[PDB]
Each structure stands twice: as structure tokens, then as C-alpha cells.
Nucleic acid binder design. Structure first.
Ligand code: MG
Ligand code: MG
Ligand code: MG
Ligand code: MG
Ligand code: MG
Ligand code: MG
Ligand code: MG
Ligand code: MG
Ligand code: MG
Ligand code: MG
Ligand code: MG
Ligand code: MG
Ligand code: MG
Ligand code: MG
Ligand code: MG
Ligand code: MG
Ligand code: MG
Ligand code: MG
Ligand code: MG
Ligand code: MG
Ligand code: MG
Ligand code: MG
Ligand code: MG
Ligand code: MG
Ligand code: MG
Ligand code: MG
Ligand code: ZN
Ligand code: ZN
Lengths: 81, 127, 214, 100, 25
RNA sequence: CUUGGAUUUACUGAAGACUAACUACUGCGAAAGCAUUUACCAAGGACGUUUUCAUUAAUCAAGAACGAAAGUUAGGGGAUCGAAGAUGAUCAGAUACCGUCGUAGUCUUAACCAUAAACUAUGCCGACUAGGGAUCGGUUGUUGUUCUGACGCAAUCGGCACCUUACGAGAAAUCAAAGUCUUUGGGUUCUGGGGGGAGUAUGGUCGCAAGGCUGAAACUUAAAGGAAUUGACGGAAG
């Protein structure tokens, strides 16, 4: 392809790119609001969390760290902020 | 019914052993080699010598009462060749064709799980 | 000069009751003389007989059982279990390329203090919908399978007597349990106990052996 | 000049490969370089599979196979015609020969 | 001649030279 | 070597080595190299990260660590192969190839040695230039699939490679780098200057030695050499 709009790439091909290989690099991670099943208390958790985060109310582990995104424990529902 | 021995056929590339024992292998009944059938060393391992050795083995087996045998064919094995010699196939066909009954057949060539150094040197035997 | 076959006496080999066809075959030995009794020189002999012969079924054609005689009753030989092994052709027909082979062994003693080495073997299974050429398991998975093999052989040997273990070995109970236990690690095929070795035997119990002979 | 881009062996991303002995002459040859053939032959020749089945005491007894993997050095293989000299352009073809 | 044997011949001749010079040091 | 029972057969044991098959245009390591299980010890790349510090970096005379095999010194081991040696063949002669034995060695512990066609015969760092399918590790999205894992389908980062083309390069063989080089300049280290004499002599230095590193000249010489073409020949194939 000799002629191509480099300033306005197609968002479909833009979304398959590596996070550092876009026009302006931007993280693909996010922050979540985690509802444990026992109670209702907003606890902000990083999507790619490296810590076994526990909510303040009840000392229950919300997520277990993995290679990539943190894995939420059973009964824990997340909502992206 | 039948009386089983064990026909331990060791077929190397220089000779052929037809050795019939009992089930345990502690009692030798008949051991005839291809070198007992010819007067030339070059054909001690010939199929013809193996066939004659097998016929003499079968004749000895019959007069002792062995009516069937299990087969344990082996090559030299170890660090040497794992393919059976040319006489093992002839000794097996002659035994089957001599009225002896055939049971299980197995290859029992010794195979190392690695091994010691094989003769010939690094460059092999140059011919 | 003497025809040593005129002095041979034939004996019958009897297998333990764990098998079906207990009439293993016939052997011979020098006839009992004054210097040497036939009994002492005849006991301790080991016969290697195919399990398909000991059971009639052709499903056991690739396994062969060693029976060790340790009591003589007239012309009958009372044998006991001496070891298990796969045939060489069976093992060679199982060891293909483009798959992972996993092996394990363990030294374990039975309830009646029979010291055994038990060898387990398995291969990675190709899924029916698989497209890629090879079926390799990661070495961590192979270590987990090997550990599960070892603790299953240890449990299923230390928890039973040698006769019961023989009755477990014939239908591949342990191999089926290893395959079931490793389902969540990696699909496996041809899980077998491919060899059992007697290292040390307990003090001879003729009554216990006789219970294994009818 | 350079005859083969692979230098006549199969070592890339590797430093050293332990040797194997030629089946025919016991020459030390690198494992990646050795010409390896897997042969599965019937243990009984087809002429004798009949008389041995008639002499068999077992109804429906399957004759065992003979499994073997053979290693040859370049000289062993060329001499035994396991591999042959190919043309310059035909050397690159590395698919198994279409005979079977 | 082969380079390896040419090298061996020269090594043996250097060895001889050193041994000969050592007599008079 | 063998009727003094060899070879063969079953059982048992002991020694040293070595880790077959699985094993691959697959993995790891700075390279040399690394393949039975488990435990322990300390490392490591890649990936993931909306963590942290902010130029701390690239290449490097001098100077260091490691460095196949063989070899040296001293203990231990010495199964198997096996320099030297002994021996039987072949031959005109073979103290060569072939056969049977065999000592150093091969293994290990303390030290030395510092070299290999140590090769990808291709320095390292950075950027860009072309299509494609595989594959290993990580991550992220998803099935007419088997039983969470496996597999399947997509993306991506990193590797080991491979196939096609030749924009381009090249003397050509060939090369996705050996391209972006007379339209000659991204950074930097090392090396070469016709063939021999010669990696020799001499001096120095390291080494127990074997030897390593550094390293000439006289004299001699018109080619030596690289890649490819046609032919001729081959105790090469068809
Ligand atoms: Mg030749
Ligand atoms: Mg995996
Ligand atoms: Mg050439
Ligand atoms: Mg190398
Ligand atoms: Mg192994
Ligand atoms: Mg691997
Ligand atoms: Mg490196
Ligand atoms: Mg510098
Ligand atoms: Mg320096
Ligand atoms: Mg020593
Ligand atoms: Mg001579
Ligand atoms: Mg020797
Ligand atoms: Mg030494
Ligand atoms: Mg060295
Ligand atoms: Mg050098
Ligand atoms: Mg190389
Ligand atoms: Mg160089
Ligand atoms: Mg450099
Ligand atoms: Mg670059
Ligand atoms: Mg640039
Ligand atoms: Mg992947
Ligand atoms: Mg990512
Ligand atoms: Mg190319
Ligand atoms: Mg390349
Ligand atoms: Mg010059
Ligand atoms: Mg040329
Ligand atoms: Zn909570
Ligand atoms: Zn060769």
C-alpha cells in the first residue's frame, strides 16, 4: 500500500496493535469496582493487580494474581470504572 | 495337551544358535549351531545351515517329548547390531515345518538404555 | 555315552489361584539321587509365561508373568508371583514420535513385606479435533503426572497384600486410576504398569503360599 | 563454496549435539547429521507366515512386528543407496520421496 | 604436504632448536 | 578361547562408565556446552504491569572471568573402547587401511594448560525497507471439540528457524541481510593490504612441560587465489 492515512488508522486495525505500537501508547488495563458476595462495599481493584487485594469490610481475598489480569475469587463481581 | 519348550534362536551375522530349553531355561535339551552343519566358516550363519540345525533340533525334541515351543529370537544386541541374522528366519521356518508346534514368538535382543563404547573408533571401520 | 535324558523326571508347574489356567506347563530335572535331592535343586526356579496363556484371553498377549517355584509336592510345582514386564515389541509399538513419553518408578513394600519396584509409563494423547502435528506436554505437567503416578503406585501397593496386588495388576486397575487421576493435568493414553520387580522377599510362609494354590 | 544452507546437518540455535554410531561402520556422526530411518518389518517373512500359522497352537495369533530405528553416517547411507546424489536444484527438496 | 603435518614438522624442528641451544644455554 | 566344557541358556551379584527409544530444521546458556528421578542452593530470559529511579547508556586500548577435545602433575578409580605396543591377514613392501588383544587415556578429586573448520568461516548497539505459513515461551479475546485441563480459532510481544520474490546488493555462488554503499557520513571495537620465506628467527612475557601470546628481515617469486562455464575423466548415481 503506497497511499495510506497514517494519521487516522482504522480503529479495527488500531485495536489489534500492541499497547506501545499505537500512535500514542495507551494502557489496555483498567480499574474495577469489586462487589464481594457477602456485602456491598466499593473496592477499587487494578485489572492487572499483582496483589491479593482484600476489601476493607471483610478480610476476604478479592483476586489472586496471575501472569496477566488478576483472577477474581468466586462470588466476586467486577464493574469497570 | 502339548508339552512346551523354549526355542531360543540367537541369530548373529557369523553363526546361528538353535537352543531349546524348558520353560525356565535352566535345562538344555538340544543346542545345534549352524557351524556343526558345514565345514566352511563363511557359511556357518547360512540359512541352509540354520535349517539343518533346526531339523536336528526338532528331531531331538521329538524323542524327548517336547511337542511345542515358544520362540525367543535374538540378535547380538548390546552395542552391536539389533537386526537378527539371516539364519534366524530359516531356523524358525524349519522348526515350524518340522511338526513341532509353535506358541508365542518374541524378539529378546539385548538393547542398552543409553551404553558402553562401541568398537571401531571415532572414524569407524574404514573399508 | 549315557544319554542324560533317560535320567530326567518331569514335574508339573502350578500357578497361584489369582490366575485362571493354573497348569503352566511341564519341566524336568535330573532324577533324585543320593547326593542331590530333586526338591532342593528344583525349588527357586523361575518360569516366564505369557499372561494370555495364564488367562485364556488374548487381551493380555503383551504382558508376561514370572512365576517362582518355592514348594514341591510330589510331581507338582507350587509357584508364586515373581515379576511383571511388557513385551519388547509392545513397548516399541507404543513409543512413537511427535508425542511425549512419561515414566515413573517407585520402590514400595506390600502388606506382607514384599519389596517391589513398580514402573509406570504413559504417553500424551492427541485430541480428536487437534490440528497441530505434535502432542507435547510441558515438563511441569510431566512432573505433576510423574508425582501422581508415584503416589498412586505407593498407595495401591502399600495398601494391599501381594496376592491382592496381582489381582489388581491383571485388569490394569492402577493404570486406569492413574489415567483418571491425571485427566486435569494432560490427556494421557496407554497408561500401563509396564514392569514390577521383586527385590526382597519376606520369610517363607508355606501356609500362605498353599492358600494361593487351592 | 557453500554447498548447503544447512551445512549438511540440522543444527540451528544450538552449539553442540552428541554423536551416534553408524549402524554399518560405527563411525561417530552428530545426531542431527545422521541419516535416520525407522523400519517396521514383519518378524516372519510372508513365505513363512502360512506354515507358521498352521504350526501355531493359538487360534487367531497375531505375528509380532520388528521395530528398529537405523542411524547411518553419510558414507554408510550413500554407499548403501539409502540416499543418492541429487541435482543442484533437487537438493533443496526435503519432503519424503513419493514412493509409498 | 598437509598443513597439519607441516605444522607438526615445524614444531618438532623448533623443539630441536631449543634443545640444541640449551646445551650452551 | 575350547570335552580341564568354550560358545549358548536361566537365576543372582559386583564394578565402573553411559543416559537409547521419546529426540524434532524443538528448548536453554556469554560461549565452550547442556538430556534418568527427586530434593536443596543461588541465578536467568521473555511476557504482564496506569510500580519505581531518571540518562544511570553503546562500543570498548589496558586489565579480567569462562573456555570442547587432547595433553601435564598428584590421589582415587580403572567396565568398555583404545594413541604407543604386541600380533593375524593383504601387499613388491606396508610396523596402513581389515581382525584379536592391549599401556597412557577415557571417569572422578585438587591444580595447570588456553587452543579447535572454538563456523553462521558473517563483531556489537540502534533505525528503516516485503510478502507467507509454521513453531517455542508469555499475555489477551473466543468453539458443531474431548474431559478444570487439553485442543480449536484469533491477535499480539519476544526467540529458533523456514518458504517465496528480488525493490536492493553482489564477481558470482548467493543474501531479508551479505539491503537502505560514487545519489559514497547512525555509534563504536577489532582485523587485512600479491604469493612464499613464516607464525619462522630474534627479544620479551606466561606455562611444570607440551606449548600460548607478541613477532621480523634477508632472500625469492608472476602469479597464488575466489566464484562460475564448457569439456574430459571418476575404482560416483541413474
Ligand atoms: Mg569406502
Ligand atoms: Mg503448553
Ligand atoms: Mg567441493
Ligand atoms: Mg562447535
Ligand atoms: Mg533416558
Ligand atoms: Mg523441550
Ligand atoms: Mg550471548
Ligand atoms: Mg576502544
Ligand atoms: Mg584486551
Ligand atoms: Mg592418575
Ligand atoms: Mg605386514
Ligand atoms: Mg581393547
Ligand atoms: Mg588426568
Ligand atoms: Mg586447552
Ligand atoms: Mg584461533
Ligand atoms: Mg559449523
Ligand atoms: Mg577466524
Ligand atoms: Mg565484539
Ligand atoms: Mg540492525
Ligand atoms: Mg539507520
Ligand atoms: Mg503462543
Ligand atoms: Mg499485552
Ligand atoms: Mg532466501
Ligand atoms: Mg539467514
Ligand atoms: Mg603479502
Ligand atoms: Mg573452483
Ligand atoms: Zn468483602
Ligand atoms: Zn565414514
Amino acid at each position: 500500500v503506497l497511499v495510506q492515512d497514517l494519521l487516522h488508522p482504522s480503529p479495527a486495525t488500531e485495536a489489534k496493535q500492541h499497547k506501545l505500537k499505537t500512535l500514542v501508547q495507551q494502557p489496555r488495563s483498567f480499574f474495577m469496582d469489586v462487589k464481594c458476595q457477602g456485602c456491598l462495599n466499593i473496592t477499587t481493584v487494578f485489572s492487572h493487580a499483582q496483589t491479593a487485594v482484600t476489601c476493607d469490610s471483610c478480610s476476604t481475598v478479592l483476586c489472586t494474581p496471575t501472569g496477566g489480569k488478576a483472577k477474581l475469587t468466586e462470588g466476586c463481581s467486577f464493574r469497570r470504572k | 495337551s502339548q508339552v512346551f519348550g523354549v526355542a531360543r534362536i540367537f541369530a548373529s551375522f557369523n553363526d546361528t544358535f538353535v537352543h531349546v530349553t524348558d520353560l525356565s531355561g535352566k535345562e538344555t535339551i538340544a543346542r545345534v549351531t549352524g557351524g556343526m552343519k558345514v565345514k566352511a566358516d563363511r557359511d556357518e550363519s547360512s540359512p541352509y545351515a540354520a535349517m539343518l540345525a533346526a531339523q536336528d533340533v526338532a528331531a531331538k525334541c521329538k524323542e524327548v517329548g517336547i511337542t511345542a515351543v515358544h520362540i525367543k529370537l535374538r540378535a547380538t544386541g548390546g552395542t552391536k547390531t539389533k537386526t537378527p541374522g539371516p539364519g534366524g528366519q530359516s531356523a524358525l521356518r524349519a522348526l515350524a515345518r518340522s511338526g513341532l508346534r509353535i506358541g508365542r514368538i518374541e524378539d529378546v535382543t539385548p538393547v542398552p538404555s543409553x551404553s558402553t563404547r562401541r568398537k571401531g573408533g571415532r572414524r569407524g571401520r574404514r573399508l | 555315552v549315557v544319554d542324560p535324558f533317560t535320567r530326567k523326571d518331569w514335574f508339573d508347574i502350578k500357578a497361584p489361584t489369582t490366575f485362571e489356567n493354573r497348569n503352566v506347563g511341564k519341566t524336568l530335572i535330573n532324577r533324585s539321587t543320593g547326593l542331590k535331592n530333586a526338591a532342593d535343586g528344583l525349588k527357586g526356579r523361575v518360569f516366564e509365561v505369557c499372561l494370555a496363556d495364564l488367562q485364556g484371553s488374548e487381551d493380555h498377549s503383551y504382558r508376561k508373568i514370572k512365576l517362582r517355584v518355592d514348594e514341591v509336592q510330589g510331581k507338582n510345582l507350587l509357584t508364586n508371583f515373581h515379576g511383571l514386564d511388557f513385551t519388547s515389541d509392545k513397548l516399541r509399538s507404543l513409543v512413537r514420535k511427535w508425542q511425549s513419553l512419561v515414566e515413573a518408578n517407585v520402590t514400595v513394600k506390600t502388606s506382607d513385606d514384599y519389596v517391589l519396584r513398580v514402573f509406570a509409563i504413559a504417553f500424551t494423547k492427541r485430541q480428536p479435533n487437534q490440528i497441530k502435528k505434535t502432542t507435547y506436554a510441558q515438563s511441569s505437567k510431566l512432573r505433576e503426572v510423574r508425582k501422581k503416578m508415584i503416589e498412586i503406585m505407593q498407595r495401591e501397593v502399600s495398601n494391599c497384600t501381594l496376592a491382592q496386588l496381582t489381582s489388581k495388576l491383571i485388569p490394569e486397575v492402577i493404570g486406569r486410576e492413574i489415567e483418571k487421576s491425571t485427566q486435569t493435568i494432560f490427556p494421557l493414553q496407554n497408561v500401563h504398569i509396564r514392569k514390577v520387580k521383586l527385590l526382597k522377599q519376606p520369610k517363607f510362609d508355606l501356609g500362605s503360599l498353599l492358600a494361593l494354590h487351592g | 563454496p557453500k554447498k548447503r544452507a544447512s551445512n549438511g546437518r540440522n543444527k540451528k540455535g544450538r552449539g553442540h549435539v552428541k554423536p551416534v554410531r553408524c549402524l554399518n561402520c560405527a563411525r561417530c556422526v552428530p545426531k542431527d547429521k545422521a541419516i535416520k530411518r525407522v523400519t517396521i518389518r514383519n518378524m516372519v517373512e510372508a513365505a513363512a507366515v502360512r506354515d507358521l500359522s498352521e504350526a501355531s497352537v493359538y487360534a487367531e495369533y497375531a505375528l509380532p512386528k520388528l521395530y528398529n530405528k537405523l542411524h547411518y553416517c553419510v558414507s554408510c547411507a550413500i554407499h548403501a543407496r539409502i540416499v543418492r546424489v541429487r541435482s543442484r536444484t533437487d537438493r533443496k527438496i526435503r519432503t519424503p520421496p513419493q514412493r509409498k | 604436504m598437509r598443513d597439519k603435518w607441516r605444522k607438526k614438522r615445524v614444531r618438532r624442528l623448533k623443539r630441536k632448536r631449543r634443545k640444541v641451544r640449551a646445551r650452551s644455554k
